[PDB]
A paper describes a structure:
The rice NLR receptor Pik-1 binds the Magnaporthe oryzae effector AVR-Pik through an integrated heavy metal-associated (HMA) domain. The sensor NLR Pik-1 contains an integrated HMA domain between the CC and NB-ARC domains. Direct binding of AVR-Pik to the HMA domain is required to activate Pik-mediated immunity. However, the stealthy alleles AVR-PikC and AVR-PikF avoid interaction with Pik-HMA and evade host defenses.
Residue numbers in the entry:
A (entry chain B): 187 to 198, 200 to 263
B (entry chain C): 32 to 113
C (entry chain A): 187 to 259
Write the structure that this text describes.
């Protein structure tokens, strides 16, 4: 079933549009959302997302990225 | 110094097709708020707490326990409606 | 200025789904993008100063057809 993950990415040109675009485009993604006190984190929910392949992809195209959270969906 | 009754709610997005997480969490270093988000009650998440990954457990009233690195805590709260 | 926009898109495979979520998610002032519906064939976008006209126009150019189901504020 579904994993919830939170990613801090550096977003200062349009690294905000790039990070969301890249994350949104990844296999198995159900939702991407700007979260955290400063809207500097991306929370991703889905199935079969490799967090490390995703951190790596972001670092390559956008700039710095850091996995900060993994939570399984509680289904009951 | 830490009083959750005075902490503004975190920014969140509740995915439509998994259950709504019952708890707000709030991360402090030396009683300064660093971030906040949501997590399930009667559950567990893995969280980067400053330098270290922490396994954090939640009970049925959103009390969180975990091995926080010195100076840091993550504290829980029932979201409105749970 | 807080918007919800639900678009039905023709997404006939893994790639078209990816390309459409790429394009909605890249739009200025998007806060969140979610695949919605029992069949995951609708894109919910929430945000601020999103132009639904251009969003629809662009999708229509790139991935397949696109219909506006919902705009509410």
């Amino acid at each position: 079933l579904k994993q919830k993950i939170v990613i801090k990415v550096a977003m200062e040109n349009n690294c905000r549009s790039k990070a969301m675009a890249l994350v949104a485009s990844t296999g198995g993604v159900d939702s991407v959302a700007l979260v955290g006190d400063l809207r500097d984190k991306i929370e991703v929910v889905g199935y079969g997302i490799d967090p490390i392949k995703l951190i790596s992809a972001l670092r390559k195209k956008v700039g710095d990225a850091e996995l900060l959270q993994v939570e399984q969906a509680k289904e009951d | 110094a830490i009083d959750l009754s005075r902490e503004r709610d975190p920014n969140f997005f509740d995915n439509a097709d998994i259950p709504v997480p019952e708890c707000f969490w709030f991360m402090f270093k030396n009683n300064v708020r660093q971030d906040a988000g949501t997590c399930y009650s009667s559950w567990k998440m893995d969280k980067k707490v400053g330098p270290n990954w922490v396994h954090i457990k939640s009970d049925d009233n959103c009390n969180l326990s975990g091995d926080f690195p010195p100076g840091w805590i993550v504290l829980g709260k029932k979201r409105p409606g749970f």
